Amino acid sequence: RQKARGAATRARQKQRASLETMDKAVQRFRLQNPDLDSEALLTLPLLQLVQKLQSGELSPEAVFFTYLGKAWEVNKGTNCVTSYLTDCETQLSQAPRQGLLYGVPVSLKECFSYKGHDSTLGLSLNEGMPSESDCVVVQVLKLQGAVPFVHTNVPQSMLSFDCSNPLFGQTMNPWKSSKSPGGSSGGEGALIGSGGSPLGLGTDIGGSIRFPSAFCGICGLKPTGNRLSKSGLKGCVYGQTAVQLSLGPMARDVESLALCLKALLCEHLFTLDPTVPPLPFREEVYRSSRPLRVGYYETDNYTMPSPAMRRALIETKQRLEAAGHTLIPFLPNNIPYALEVLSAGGLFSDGGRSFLQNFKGDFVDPCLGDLILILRLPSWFKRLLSLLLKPLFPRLAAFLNSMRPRSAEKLWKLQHEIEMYRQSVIAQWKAMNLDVLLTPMLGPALDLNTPGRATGAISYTVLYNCLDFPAGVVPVTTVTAEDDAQMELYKGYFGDIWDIILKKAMKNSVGLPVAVQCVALPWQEELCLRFMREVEQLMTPQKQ
Amino acid sequence: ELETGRQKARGAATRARQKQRASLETMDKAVQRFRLQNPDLDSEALLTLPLLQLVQKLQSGELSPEAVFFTYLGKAWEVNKGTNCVTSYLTDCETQLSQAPRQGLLYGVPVSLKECFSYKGHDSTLGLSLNEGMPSESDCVVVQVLKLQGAVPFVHTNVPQSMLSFDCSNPLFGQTMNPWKSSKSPGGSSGGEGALIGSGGSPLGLGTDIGGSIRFPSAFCGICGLKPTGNRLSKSGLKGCVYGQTAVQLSLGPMARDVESLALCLKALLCEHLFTLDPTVPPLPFREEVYRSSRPLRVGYYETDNYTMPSPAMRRALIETKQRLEAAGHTLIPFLPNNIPYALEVLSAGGLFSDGGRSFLQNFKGDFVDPCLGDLILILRLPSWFKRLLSLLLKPLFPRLAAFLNSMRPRSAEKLWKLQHEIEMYRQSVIAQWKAMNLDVLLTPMLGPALDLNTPGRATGAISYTVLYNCLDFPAGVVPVTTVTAEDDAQMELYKGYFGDIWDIILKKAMKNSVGLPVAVQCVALPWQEELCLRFMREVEQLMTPQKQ
Numbered sequence A: 001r002q003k004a005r006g007a008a009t010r011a012r013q014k015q016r017a018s019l020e021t022m023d024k025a026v027q028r029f030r031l032q033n034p035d036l037d038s039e040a041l042l043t044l045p046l047l048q049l050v051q052k053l054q055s056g057e058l059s060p061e062a063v064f065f066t067y068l069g070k071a072w073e074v075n076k077g078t079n080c081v082t083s084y085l086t087d088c089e090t091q092l093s094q095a096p097r098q099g100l101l102y103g104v105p106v107s108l109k110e111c112f113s114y115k116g117h118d119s120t121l122g123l124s125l126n127e128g129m130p131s132e133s134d135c136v137v138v139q140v141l142k143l144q145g146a147v148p149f150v151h152t153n154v155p156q157s158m159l160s161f162d163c164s165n166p167l168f169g170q171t172m173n174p175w176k177s178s179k180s181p182g183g184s185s186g187g188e189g190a191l192i193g194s195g196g197s198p199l200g201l202g203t204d205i206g207g208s209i210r211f212p213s214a215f216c217g218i219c220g221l222k223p224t225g226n227r228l229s230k231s232g233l234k235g236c237v238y239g240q241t242a243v244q245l246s247l248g249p250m251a252r253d254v255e256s257l258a259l260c261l262k263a264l265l266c267e268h269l270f271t272l273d274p275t276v277p278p279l280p281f282r283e284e285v286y287r288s289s290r291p292l293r294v295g296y297y298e299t300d301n302y303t304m305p306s307p308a309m310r311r312a313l314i315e316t317k318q319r320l321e322a323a324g325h326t327l328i329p330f331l332p333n334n335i336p337y338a339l340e341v342l343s344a345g346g347l348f349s350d351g352g353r354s355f356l357q358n359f360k361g362d363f364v365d366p367c368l369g370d371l372i373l374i375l376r377l378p379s380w381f382k383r384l385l386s387l388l389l390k391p392l393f394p395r396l397a398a399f400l401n402s403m404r405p406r407s408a409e410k411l412w413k414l415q416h417e418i419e420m421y422r423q424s425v426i427a428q429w430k431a432m433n434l435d436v437l438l439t440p441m442l443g444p445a446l447d448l449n450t451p452g453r454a455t456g457a458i459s460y461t462v463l464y465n466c467l468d469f470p471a472g473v474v475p476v477t478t479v480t481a482e483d484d485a486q487m488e489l490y491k492g493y494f495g496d497i498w499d500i501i502l503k504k505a506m507k508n509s510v511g512l513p514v515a516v517q518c519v520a521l522p523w524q525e526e527l528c529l530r531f532m533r534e535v536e537q538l539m540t541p542q543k544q
Numbered sequence B: 001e002l003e004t005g006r007q008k009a010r011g012a013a014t015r016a017r018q019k020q021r022a023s024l025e026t027m028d029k030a031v032q033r034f035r036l037q038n039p040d041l042d043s044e045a046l047l048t049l050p051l052l053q054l055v056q057k058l059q060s061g062e063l064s065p066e067a068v069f070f071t072y073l074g075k076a077w078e079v080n081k082g083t084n085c086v087t088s089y090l091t092d093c094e095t096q097l098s099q100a101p102r103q104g105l106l107y108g109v110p111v112s113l114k115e116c117f118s119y120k121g122h123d124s125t126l127g128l129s130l131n132e133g134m135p136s137e138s139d140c141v142v143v144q145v146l147k148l149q150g151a152v153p154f155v156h157t158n159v160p161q162s163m164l165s166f167d168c169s170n171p172l173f174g175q176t177m178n179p180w181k182s183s184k185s186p187g188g189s190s191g192g193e194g195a196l197i198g199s200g201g202s203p204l205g206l207g208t209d210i211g212g213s214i215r216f217p218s219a220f221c222g223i224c225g226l227k228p229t230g231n232r233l234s235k236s237g238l239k240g241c242v243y244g245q246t247a248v249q250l251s252l253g254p255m256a257r258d259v260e261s262l263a264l265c266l267k268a269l270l271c272e273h274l275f276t277l278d279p280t281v282p283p284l285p286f287r288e289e290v291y292r293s294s295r296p297l298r299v300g301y302y303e304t305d306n307y308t309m310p311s312p313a314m315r316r317a318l319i320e321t322k323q324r325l326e327a328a329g330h331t332l333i334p335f336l337p338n339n340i341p342y343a344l345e346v347l348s349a350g351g352l353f354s355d356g357g358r359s360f361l362q363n364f365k366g367d368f369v370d371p372c373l374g375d376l377i378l379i380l381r382l383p384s385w386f387k388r389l390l391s392l393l394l395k396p397l398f399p400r401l402a403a404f405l406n407s408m409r410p411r412s413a414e415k416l417w418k419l420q421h422e423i424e425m426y427r428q429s430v431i432a433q434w435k436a437m438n439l440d441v442l443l444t445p446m447l448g449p450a451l452d453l454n455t456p457g458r459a460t461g462a463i464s465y466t467v468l469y470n471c472l473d474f475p476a477g478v479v480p481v482t483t484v485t486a487e488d489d490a491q492m493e494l495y496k497g498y499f500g501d502i503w504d505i506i507l508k509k510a511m512k513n514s515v516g517l518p519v520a521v522q523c524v525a526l527p528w529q530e531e532l533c534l535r536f537m538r539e540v541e542q543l544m545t546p547q548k549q
Ligand SMILES: CCn1c(=O)n([C@H]2CCCN(c3nccc(-c4cc5ccccc5o4)n3)C2)c2ccccc21
Pocket: A158, A159, A160, A161, A183, A184, A205, A206, A207, A208, A344, A347, A368, A369, A370, A371, A374, A396, A397, A399, A400, A452, A453, A455, A458
């Protein structure tokens, strides 16, 4: 463990120097610009902020250092920032004036490769291996006048919806220090959620944009896998295509997500990565005020919603009805199958071998729970345990069996079943003539170190990675003391360890944000955002 | 497994040939009725109309949908006699004739379908006994879209057994012949389409392409074809022998007599109907302005891929169009995608046979193996340890044979992930190479002239020109530019190939005796750039064969 300790010492020194540099830069600017109303600057919605930047009312310098100062401050309570992207102060002066994001500071999840910086993923083997170019989406952000300013924290190896690693440590929810910020885009959740960044980028293969957005009370969108460029993204495993990885915006309101999506969906992106279909942002779809046919469920019969989740869902259902929309009961078929064999088997087709190679000689962060221990088990023993667990705890047994290695032949079979399943859900959708789908979103935030032990609770998010449908979340309410007290009546549908842990983990959540999930068909990001906009306007009208 | 024999397969063959026989009878009887009520009709004038003029006269009302339908039906019946390209007549197509939407962009246009395009009440056998007597419950997506656009799908066309071949014979419907020379292959796997369209029997067809199956038969039969990016069009309802293989993408696209026809078909397909019926297809409309552009192009080119030695006719075809593109004011830049042997031998072969051909072999249990497949089935049936041994023994003297054999072994899911990442990195590599030379498009030789019957299955290396772009998933189209001269053909006596292995030897003999046969060039653009690829194809056609415009 000498190698791993050395990596942790190096990374913490780098993080400390980053924060110091940040601190000195903001102190210098504040003293040189004492009359600047920093509070008003920071409370500006992004759209108003960009219009002031475009007109020249606010300088890019003013916006930048004010946000840097705020980022530095919120980090003290959250530990969300791993790295200051030092060269940003010169990109600031060079920002293209006609750019749609001119002078907008943007936070980046650590896996977004940035020249001269590590993308560690909390892994020793990636420490001291800086990237030698910006990833594609970073290049286009810069060409649109945006200024990426920080790298934000992720759970070790990024397969966790908590947010801790042995290198930069544990990220905390800004609303409550004992709560997880979610993950794997947890640092983004904490930074944006506390006001330290107006716009961020995250990734999602099982919920990693949506979890931290919901837990930290911000908006996030997970597009169709290939709507945006993955070129230059750092990951633990490459070449897994059964369950689609996506990247997308995270922000304080829906309009910010739409703006970022529009800015990204430009000639620069389509030229820099020709593999991405050149689908322009269709403004006509996003701005539509036509009444919607909205499918909805208030439970997936897999993860029992918290009282706060259920109320959030019913209330927005009611408000959408009152607004003239048609609400139709709808549940994607065969959810247990889609999670237990398709999703779990898609993510772990090789039994976790590729994934495990990253952990050789490294600490295993507590927030990952028993994942690594389980994956290390021999395939015969996984099968054996699965057979024994099945009569008593079928959820655990199904996952365990699906986390075994298989042949290329069996992968083809799985990929085909994923295609057929996607077809089946599309057919259901069509048969009910839906435009859109409203679902619950896992919340309120779980206690630190519990997401790793409540695996079933990914049911609400991972389904739409498997299906590869655009899915976003919007904050709609907060946990009342009434909601929180009702957790004592929560039993889950199965009563296995996942239910038991989840019950405990969702307690003590008064005042915490609670979200709802919005889904559309593949390539319909604009329609998904149109529906997110509607939810936002109805449930939280002050946001618009 | 117990040997089950061939009795079931034989019953399938006699049943399938009867369905074929009855189809052609029904066709002939329908056109005879029509001709007896229309002695006035100038058949050969209507048949010689370029598709665009044909659709225009259909739209104005100058020609009736009945007139063009029965005239083409009669021509299709006639050209089939010497080609054996039709497997089935889509019997309910006269009701689509009367239901055809008058505002549809393909109103009254008869369209030929490769057998794998599932059509309600009809088998999609793939020449495989186990798919005989298994009628499709519905039209596939693209067929629905064609009908919604007013087209009249009228025939299913032949394929080599299982479609994993660029010849065109199966044990059910037999062998399809090149219309230019009965001893020659029409190409494949869209061979029926090649033979039918190339002899005037259909103004527009649909085929598929995972290794060259649109481009081969188009080039061999002297027509144009386009292989789009894999997911530019819908694969929903397409009959295949293997499902779940996603390393090397399958594509579908048009085949016709001119590039303008290809562009019309793509435009008609790329509509709300398609994007609704299959939401997995990105809703990318046909970009008219890109297709119609007349700006000078930066054209990359190569005379050879250093893997398959071009025929003298291939090489001349490439140089001539290179020179005429330069004379028309474009800049031609020497360009060869890096690491082609890797792309073919490990990426393409490995991607197509990741499971060692196991899934593929299930389709052949109890069935005849068509001779046009060569030793493919025999090789795939070999145990993994034995393929390995042979590969190691073959390596020093015959590296091509060794690498293909090794890559056709089964592997783990772990190794497939690694391979899928390698294909993705290779795609970014060639894209960066392309960008650093600032190319617009890429000019490539296209395999030709047509190989003798039963030789494509024995000259596997020759897929190098086409499958490279399935591996890269770039749009790639093909256009006829010249014919084999006596001088081109005589120079085959000097043909050696780069490797001198069995594949080169077979190809040398297979390309001889081709005087007068059509030879093509291949046009390539970046992913999702179908309109630009068509723009370039239009240019090549205009300069090499101006009468077609
Ligand atoms: C949204 C973030 N995210 C996840 O939450 N996951 C999940 C997916 C399913 C397995 N997973 C997990 N983790 C910890 C423990 C177990 C576990 C299984 C088990 C079977 C019997 C008995 C006990 C058990 O624990 N499983 C991690 C991701 C996987 C890849 C990438 C991102 C991921």
